[model samples]
Target: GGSVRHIAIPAHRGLITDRNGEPLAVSTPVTTLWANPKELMTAKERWPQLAAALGQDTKLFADRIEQNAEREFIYLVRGLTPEQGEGVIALKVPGVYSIEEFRRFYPAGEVVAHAVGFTDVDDRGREGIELAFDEWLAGVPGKRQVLKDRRGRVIKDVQVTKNAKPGKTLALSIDLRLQYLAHRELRNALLENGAKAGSLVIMDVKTGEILAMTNQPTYNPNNRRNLQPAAMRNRAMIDVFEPGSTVKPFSMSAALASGRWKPSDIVDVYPGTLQIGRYTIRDVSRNSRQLDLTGILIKSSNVGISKIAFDIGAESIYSVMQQVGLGQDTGLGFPGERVGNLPNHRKWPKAETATLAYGYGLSVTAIQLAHAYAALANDGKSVPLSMTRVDRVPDGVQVISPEVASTVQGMLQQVVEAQGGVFRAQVPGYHAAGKSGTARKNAYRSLFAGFAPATDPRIAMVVVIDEPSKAGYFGGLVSAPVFSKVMAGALRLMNVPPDNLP
Candidate 1:
């Protein structure tokens, strides 16, 4: 067996930045004070001076030093500022030594804590990007062999057994400015609507790059006081719920993609309610009318979409859903990302199939639903979702022909203009198209997912309001406004010119 020796030192790690080179998380140089209890006892009289300078209670310090007399290493202060470091070091108390360390700093703090994550007391990535990229963010620890005199000070030669390597930098796909806008809007939406909690995500329609994602009840990573665990959960990726009417476009697209239906193909959704097997489905508006495939989306007609789904059949619809990246992870590289629960076709009841057409029965993350809509917005080619910088454009599969995609976009635009579903989401100078989803909170959940600027779509977003206490809660009433504000800012931020519409 080889001889073993103990060493005490701190290691350095790399910083994490946003896509625009904004620092999200960083490790700054710090000094931690420690002491050997045995040596501290011999210099007991100096305890008061040391405690005063280190900002510790003299009485408590004396008790700890006495109690842990046999302990060789005892931490006094974990992270000391430069002024505090110099103050304590100037005391020059015997047996007390300052070890150089690194403390994590998040410039954006709570605004991005849930996304950037935090490290543990030992400077280890405990969760979030810190945990996801721990290997790349944590530097290698260097070991040193030294001979010390009785006083614990180095008396002779020092030899380095191993050299340290700093961690590599991580650039996230998130845009800090957009992230701030999303957070601000979400917070205001929750407060103004008196909702329990809220979450929002903004994704690039063409590339599936997550430009902004945030949740309400977020806390400051630097000062995590009175923060709840629920606040730390990344709702955009982890919370799964029925997408409600937001899923309607997918069903309609499946039908159109099969060449069995066209934008002008009309379905008579008479009486607003239709029966299949033992179950009956009805629309919220209860307006039974002849609606084209485009009209079905604008009015968000449940019966119309169900009719389309029925015509497309289960197998074709399921295949299309799979192609759009449903029933699986989007591979955004976030920990605890859910694939969402989608029932098997064999277990599907007649009601289940129809219900899924209107965003029920099947479950999906907010990000998943947003990305699926993004495919249509991106001209029917579906790309993988990403939270990190995508240096090369991701290749996409032609899920639907470009012609079909363009038609769907036109239909989606009608959802905002004529249908008045997500009308608020329509920016003054842009053709915005999005679907409003207002599903019941189940026993414990509420949801809202939509995208904007229907023509030449620039932003796709989702808003989830969990467990509202107020009445008349709907995605259009609550989340749509937030969607409007965020989308407006995102458009201007990207410098997308206003539409030429008069």
Candidate 2:
């Protein structure tokens, strides 16, 4: 009687596509060559040709096959193209065999790798979007009854016991064009600045969809053999850093929303320094002796912002920061997402409070800051950030008053407009608003958080260049230019009409 067995047939993994229906991650049929070493020993003379066909060293190949001769099965090579597989089959070596398997390919490679992630050799999702929706993307293998001879070779196929179910497609919200633009800009900036690591994120202000998210030190998903752990991290949502001056607008927003300060009200920032319980906070720019709320941001005065934060105290600032998406999840449920830290002590000392004002004593992931900025860009309408495409714009909760948000947006416009300020963040034909920050801890983190088309904002972005050791370490110098270039290209790619076409 012949041996009857149920053979398992591998199914195709689902496609991971962008919102435009362009494939980001795909599974294609590939052949894996293996051997039944014990059976192959009968045809010893054909070993050289098998090695030659696989382009493997003849001696080394024979040694390996001989070493595993006692085993019933051994893997020879995997991921062969269709032509190579056919050529291998032509050899018809008794022990040599091939199996159909799915191999995952990332079309966008490292450009979108941080977001799209990769799979293992067995086509199992490992990280990023791949791991996040693994169950939805993995296929169920089918079974077919087959008759085999005494040598264990398939003789006749009976019937399919179960039909294979291909995985469902997952469409991400990322726009590939914008992702490339952001990737190139961020990589160039990092290279030019000699930064150790960096992250850049762009989100739709209205829908809160992540349009593009790129990181330096990224690994190519298509090739993971030599991947470094550092390169595999998606820093946009996992790595946390002190936001530095980028959060000044939130403090300003708190001040305005508290009904104690007006946009036009002037404050004495003379001497460009403030002493809070022996802790002297100095302004980077000492040019202004006194400045209005808008002037304080334009000058990027730590002293000025500290004075404002201290005046309003911690409650309002903390409350406003929370409302605008901080110290919380972005709701995307991205793998390894961190909520970051926001201190909520019952009472704050003057020095601690001052540091909190200028974006110290608190930490945030790039996505958190971008979400907060998106809320500001959307006129204080806070929406949960999404990694997948959003068909309908969800109803947003008003985190800050529309009037306060508009006023802050206008002030940020002045920050970009000023010649000596973050002018590098200005888009050529659009009104852009942004704030730059240089935070120092174990190393420096240059950060820029902003939105474009200030009059009617559509996109909010955040760029963080970590540990810039060469050309410049300042956010304005290292990060603002990247923000400007990427935002400019993204605005055009998304066809968001320019508000200030000169």
Candidate 3:
């Protein structure tokens, strides 16, 4: 019954920053106004001034107060600006008071919204990294005893029960420069190509750290008015699609792993068609009458690769694909992270097996594609992918022999350098190794997976454009350019020396 009363002190939430220590999300102080409904109703003459200061309808404000008269405490306004709170307090309406709270703010806005996520009104993490590490980022509030005046306004500090503790700061693996580049290019490409959706991911080949991950149809976490769940989805790690021809590299690795095949072995793809049981697989474009292992990849020949898949059998091919982390969790712990399907059949059909050679029977997320390609770039070593910053290279499993991985990598280089290859994916002064895939089901999925400076690879990336309405929906046409633009800029931004300069 004395003047002393117990009160709670607000604690600051953690800051979310990029790898470069650039702030992505922060918490700022905001004022909330509350009232004792019984006492507020008695001050009818001050109701209009209070409503005017809060920018609310006077009659509605008075009615709401009157309706809540039975309650001891009712919130008049929340998330009010300091100036607005001051205006309300200047009116000195009996029983009206202001309290302190922290509001989450995103500085990068929609650029990194899908990755950093947002918080709710009470500063609780709601999505993305925010939800993934909520406990570590939320600190405990402090308690204090304070002396109040006869009217119940706090007047003097009495004793400190506890000290407010700020949350720990979080550093993500994403580099803001690369993130911005990918975001700009992906958004521009979607509009230019008339694609319904798109996703892109970049990873460091050595450490398996995600440098930049972005998806189109993203929403601004800072201003989420009328936001749809569709726009909030992290398509890079959540949505899955048929990889089409992108998985051909893994098949070629399987062919090389076996003693039956070598890079120089000849295979006939003449007329660009192969018949297995009732299915006849045909390549859209005709290739030379015969091609070596390198020509098979350079031309992205369906007939040539399927012959190898048929020879090695399904079990052997599945072994290599599984080893590269298909159909497995990425260990990201991100909300709704999907492990795309990688099927295994007890009795393999000739046609389905053949299609598997060209990436038709399986689906993968963009992150999975990037992870698999990173293995190919990192001398066949498959390391666990990380969303947070990694200081050193972690132990990895050897998915393919170093010699076989090198051979497959060289074959992919021809896909970018050869006349029939994906020339659009070529960077200006760096040697790029990449494969393009175009699959048509409901609509065309244009995809490209690749690594750069082939001689000494530093990064691996994958780009997917869904349902591009443009005439040329091929991966080389729609997705390769995006890879090229982003890779070219990312390589320089990361300070990798050019290896292909004349």
List lDDT for all candidates, in order: 0.78, 0.88, 0.88
Which parts of model 3 are misplaced by more than 4 Å? 1-8, 144-161
List the lowest-lDDT window of 10 residues for candidate 3.
147-156
**Candidate 2 Cα deviation (angstroms), residue 234:** 1.9
lDDT of 2 at 348: 79
Taking all chains together, each candidate's TM-score versus the true structure is 0.94, 0.94, 0.94
* Quality of model 1 by C-alpha lDDT: 0.78
Clashing pairs in 3: none
State the RMSD for candidate 2.
2.1
Candidate 1, residue 122: how far the Cα is off, in Å: 1.1
